[PDB]
From Swiss-Prot:
Use in biotech settings: Green fluorescent protein has been engineered to produce a vast number of variously colored mutants, fusion proteins, and biosensors. Further generation of mutants led to more stable proteins (at 37 degrees Celsius for example) with brighter fluorescence and longer fluorescence lifetimes.
Effect of mutating residue 198 to Y: Gives rise to yellow-emission variants. In EYFP; leads to yellow fluorescence, folds faster and more efficiently at 37 degrees Celsius and has superior solubility and brightness
Outcome (variant: residue 142 to P): Increases fluorescence at warmer temperatures such as 37 degrees Celsius
Keyword field: Chromophore, Luminescence, Photoprotein
Consequence of changing residue 64 to H: In P4; leads to no detectable fluorescence. In mut2.2; shifts fluorescence lifetime from 3.03 to 1.94 ns. In mut3.3; shifts fluorescence lifetime from 3.03 to 1.88 ns
Protein name as it appears in the record: Green fluorescent protein
Recorded consequence of changing residue 144 to K: Increases fluorescence at warmer temperatures such as 37 degrees Celsius. In Esmerald; leads to brighter fluorescence. In VisGreen; leads to brighter fluorescence
Record flagged with keyword Nucleus: no
Impact after mutating residue 100 to T: In EBFP1.2; shifts the excitation and emission spectra to shorter wavelengths and increases quantum yields compared to BFP
Job description of the protein: Energy-transfer acceptor. Its role is to transduce the blue chemiluminescence of the protein aequorin into green fluorescent light by energy transfer. Fluoresces in vivo upon receiving energy from the Ca(2+)-activated photoprotein aequorin.
Organism listed in the record: Aequorea victoria
Result of altering residue 145 to I: In Azurite; shifts the excitation and emission spectra to shorter wavelengths and increases quantum yields compared to BFP
Length: 224
């Protein structure tokens, strides 16, 4: 029944509250998802002023229910099967030689709108590292999200790496560990091992003076 909620274009709202090394901030996002094409278009605004971390480091945190699952893999789509009640998504994100983010999000429908409500806590960051020093390029990210079942939680786990370009030509690795658990008590689809091929293009609205990010993203399941 959850998959039927994604056959057309679905409005998306994202709300994040964060604290990284004591720097508190909030982000609000709005956009649309079209799972038929695995396509997401969103604009995010820092509602508290200036974002204290680089926008690219928040992309993965800021709705994998919008993935395009090929017909032959649709029985492996945990994310839609949890809807409309939703799922809790938790991550730890280890920035190599720097701090970590720990995130908890609730992803669910509020009426016809798919909502991603997030809390983010970052600790152990270096004052003059790539994150708090804002040394990362405003650059796209792309990678594969490796998904496995977590029967014990009636959910899934995932792992993946993001390579963020640094301004000097080097790379800041962000190792992601993820867990998803359903909010409701209904049956869900527990998948065989597979991946999500994900690509995010980042841009700016030339007329927008608030600190913000425009995002175009494609997400497609594969590996079966």
């Amino acid at each position: 029944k959850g998959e039927e909620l994604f056959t057309g274009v679905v409005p998306i709202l994202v709300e994040l509250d964060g604290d990284v090394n004591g720097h508190k901030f909030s982000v609000s996002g709005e956009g649309e998802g079209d799972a038929t094409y695995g396509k997401l278009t969103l604009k995010f605004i820092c509602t508290t002023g200036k974002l204290p971390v680089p926008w690219p480091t928040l992309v993965t945190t800021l709705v994998q229910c919008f993935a395009r699952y090929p017909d032959h893999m649709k029985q492996h789509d945990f994310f839609k099967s949890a809807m409309p009640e939703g799922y809790v998504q938790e991550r730890t994100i280890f920035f190599k030689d720097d701090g970590n983010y720990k995130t908890r999000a609730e992803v669910k429908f509020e009426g016809d709108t798919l909502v991603n409500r997030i809390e983010l806590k970052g600790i152990d960051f270096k004052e003059d590292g790539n994150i708090l020093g804002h040394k990362l390029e405003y650059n796209a990210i792309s990678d594969n999200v490796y998904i496995t079942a977590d029967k014990q939680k009636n959910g899934i786990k995932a792992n993946f790496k993001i390579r963020h370009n640094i301004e000097d030509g080097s790379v800041q690795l962000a190792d992601h560990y993820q867990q998803n658990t359903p909010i409701g008590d209904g049956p869900v689809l527990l998948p065989d091992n597979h991946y999500l091929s994900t690509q995010s293009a980042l841009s700016k609205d030339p007329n927008e003076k608030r600190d913000h990010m425009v995002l175009l993203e494609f997400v497609t399941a594969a590996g079966i």
